[PDB]
């Protein structure tokens, strides 16, 4: 009765549940499917798209824009991300955990200045026009997309650009010196050097890029470490009403059971194996359980107020995106911090379980660590 | 043009609109029938549903929670509402008229602290992961439901909480009978008075804290006279009412009293009897004709009146009536009669020319028979 | 490639527009529902557009709807009472004024004008049901009756405290009633209500875009904007306001807004407007063409790249969704062009051309915003 791997409805694995927008030798786009569409359960996610990035070293992905806000989140590398507005530009060096909301409608590049790591990158949409899709606009002009300045009529362009149609297809079109293949391109080591030199490394700007790693964990112990950037922390997440989350764990680790009270929780697995259990209730009852087990890009949902455990396979690290984030409030079920059910009264506890109230206590206080234990042990 | 009783769209009668979530000798749990199922003219109250909770004295709801987010309010009787978070626990006593917003996904139990009522409440629900339903989330473990904490495999159990199966079963789930029958449970006075200890109360007399339980019949009345009393409070005034954009309103009626015509300018009102009987007249407009709805409300039925809209209310007994105002912020109520916060009153006299059949001369004149405000004598 | 009435995002006042009334002194008209139209633009879904048109010495009865109202005066003179319950404010609006107008405030409307007509354009945002709002009208007429008619003749009776004979006759009178919302008021009256009323919580008042300074202007067009952190009223809709006008021939470099949804509309004259969108194995453009004319309706998707060529004199208008800090990113000539910000390395590999030539053809034109239709 249980839903398990590919019949679990909040388990978007990256080899069934992602759609791939472009690929070619050296990276590619893929956007996770809708999540309503997967489930009711998580309706109110709709207004949310996931895309996950992935580009081999001393790549570029050409100049965009798209209409949906995105809240870009390095997973694994480095890179340089150049914001282009109407009247300057802005680069940066995001290092592995940083995180940079981009006002949609922003046109921007990105480029892997590592000579020898790909660059990965998890990336939240929230479509403008439509609630469930936006629309990528390549200025560029390669053999997969024309420009979107190519749309406009030979007598609009000529007047734009003050200048015969002939020089403005030869030089911008390549439509009769020739244009890339892709969207993706790889630039020569030297130019990766110029660019590379006008970033700005972080080192909570209403604007700059922020890295949650360089924040003291709020939960670390011999089993596990937790970094966690909400919207009380930032202005940007303030806006989006999102917290972030980057969580490490050894093999054999156990992050215990608990629930956010009112997040809804979208997260990626980075490196690493894990097994999830998430509880959600039967459908005047019984307990309906989620199991999955996670590997590296797979993404995995849970909603607000649900049960959950993870069991750490192997080294891992996971990141997450809490939607409806203000104020949530986690609460583990076990454990000696942030345990709610060590809240309840004795007198609770008595009605509340078979045993006797101080019964329950007592195995309550059994286990003495917190947040993360020995899943054996 | 007349659509009464139970083919009223906006009429959610406690009898034919409500599914029951759980009942026993001790209370009952229900929730109302959705509204925009009901109708589409109301379609922007689908991101809200309503409870009604109802228990005996001296009794207990289990520690619960659910993805949503509620406007708890004492209709009638008293409790204690005890918010368990990760790390503390706040308790209060709640006397009728008093509310407040529980956190989507804050741990938190019942109890009907007194020893010969029973205990009426009536929460606005907004649920967090699908906007039309929410689920409640039991952690105890009864003949009724399995604690959620039975989702976890063996393994995950002991190891997280340090002991074998065997015992953890034994002690959460046992499955002689040990555990409850259902999710309310009758406790013994003891018991009750050592869950009162911490409770805080109000106390009208001390100084307020935003964050705690509020009661708006502590404060002067907006509307007074003879024949009724209103009591409200608006987000401009409460923070947990502002967060939620929504007002809330108390209104006293003796039998007899016509709630004058009015209609709330921006505000879609979701009222619910406490005590008594009315007859209400709420006006909508056909697919120009006007569109009547008429209704015969008593104890616990539900009623909407959707911003704009018209309505007038005749008690037929005492009563008393609550209501949940959304998308409250700055609503205007615009009386369309009487002295006192009548829009009519308010209109020129060469608009009112060309607005009614007579000089405007003669509707003004027709408009000022009525001194009265707010509430007055159903039958002169 | 989509052109006139096959262009989605064309809503032309030649035929996507319902009569909701209309009589020999007026009309009011809404527009066709966006998303039923495209769902490109699905999120205008809760966004409905109303014309009105009013003749010289017109009053259009008192009513309210269950809909926030951000009312424009494209062209003509106005008189604009918002009736609260206990007083009453009373603005003069002359072409160009915005206010906007918290759903459920009743409220009539005069035309002061002796020759002029009033033509305005409303922005409604519906409470009970996202996608239609309901007008209420106070009155009685032969068209319609008071909403009052819908109570019972004994709450009727205790509420005004008389018997039904004489309410039946002051107030519904089914000495008798106008023939429908829209009414022509004698001079005497007009002057009336007018020296009450008052022109020119202050930012809670109508406000008038063009008293600002233009953010755009040149020999060939000007643009008067007021956007959400200007002004109260627009921010509590989010929206930004826009006035532009264009001589004959001028043309509007291609542009796009980041991420605000335009509505436009014109106001005067005609215009050839050029949007551009995705096509959904070369990835092509979708072209949507129209030419706009007077009272037409165009939207403007937030991203979608777009140029206009005012064949005439013109004048349009545009309400801006989804407003709050909205980049407008030109893609030529001096001012505001983001092209021009992209360094060559990476210019070199999005173009087919060198860098250095991509850059030099950028610079070609030095003039900006709006230009004259001729290289
Ligand atoms: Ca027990
Ligand atoms: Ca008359
Ligand atoms: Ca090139």
Redesign the interface.
């Known amino acids: 009765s249980d839903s398990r791997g590919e019949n679990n409805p909040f388990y978007f694995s990256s080899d069934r549940r992602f759609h791939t927008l472009f690929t070619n030798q050296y990276g590619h786009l893929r956007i996770l499917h809708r999540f309503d569409q997967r489930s ?5 996610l709709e207004n949310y798209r996931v895309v996950e990035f992935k580009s081999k070293p001393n790549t ?1 992905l ?2 965009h ?3 949906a ?1 995105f809240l870009l989140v390095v997973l694994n590398g480095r890179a340089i991300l ?1 914001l ?6 802005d680069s940066y060096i995001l290092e592995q955990g940083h995180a940079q909301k981009i ?5 921007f ?1 990105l480029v892997n200045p590592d000579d020898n790591e790909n660059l990965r990158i998890i990336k939240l949409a929230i479509p ?5 899709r936006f ?7 390669t ?11 030979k ?2 362009l ?7 149609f002939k ?2 297809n ?5 439509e009769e ?4 293949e892709g969207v993706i ?1 790889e ?1 020569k080591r030297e ?1 990766i050097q ?2 590379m030199k ?1 970033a700005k490394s972080s080192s909570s700007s209403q604007d700059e890029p922020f890295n949650l790693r360089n924040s003291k964990p709020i939960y670390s112990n011999k089993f596990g470490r937790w970094y966690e950037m909400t919207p009380e922390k930032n202005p940007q997440l303030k806006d989006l009403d999102v917290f972030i989350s980057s969580v490490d764990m050894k093999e054999g680790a ?1 992050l ?2 608990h ?4 997040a ?1 929780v979208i997260m990626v697995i980075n490196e690493g194996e894990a097994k999830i ?5 039967s459908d ?6 989620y199991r999955a087990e996670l590997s590296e890009d797979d993404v995995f949902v849970i ?5 959950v ?1 993870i ?1 750490a396979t192997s080294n891992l690290n996971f990141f997450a995106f809490g939607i ?1 984030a203000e ?9 000696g ?5 060590s ?3 004795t ?2 506890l ?6 006797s109230g101080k ?2 206590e007592k ?2 206080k ?4 917190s947040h993360f ?5």
């Open positions: 009711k359960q998580i309706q109110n570029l050409l100049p824009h798209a209409d806000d150049t282009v507005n109407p009247d300057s530009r006002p949609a409608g922003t046109t590049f403008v026009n439509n609630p469930h629309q990528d606009f390549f200025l560029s002009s053999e997969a997309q024309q420009s979107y300045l190519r749309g406009f009529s007598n609009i000529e007047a734009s650009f003050d200048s015969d020089e403005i030869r030089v911008l079109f390549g010196e020739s244009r890339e391109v630039l130019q110029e660019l006008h156990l215990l059971p629930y956010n009270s009112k809804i259990e998430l509880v959600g209730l005047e009852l019984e307990v309906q359980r909603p607000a107020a649900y049960p455990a069991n409806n104020n949530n409030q986690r609460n583990f079920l076990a454990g911090k942030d345990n709610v059910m809240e309840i009264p007198e609770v008595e009605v509340s379980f078979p045993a019964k329950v195995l309550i059994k286990q003495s660590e234990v020995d899943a054996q042990p």
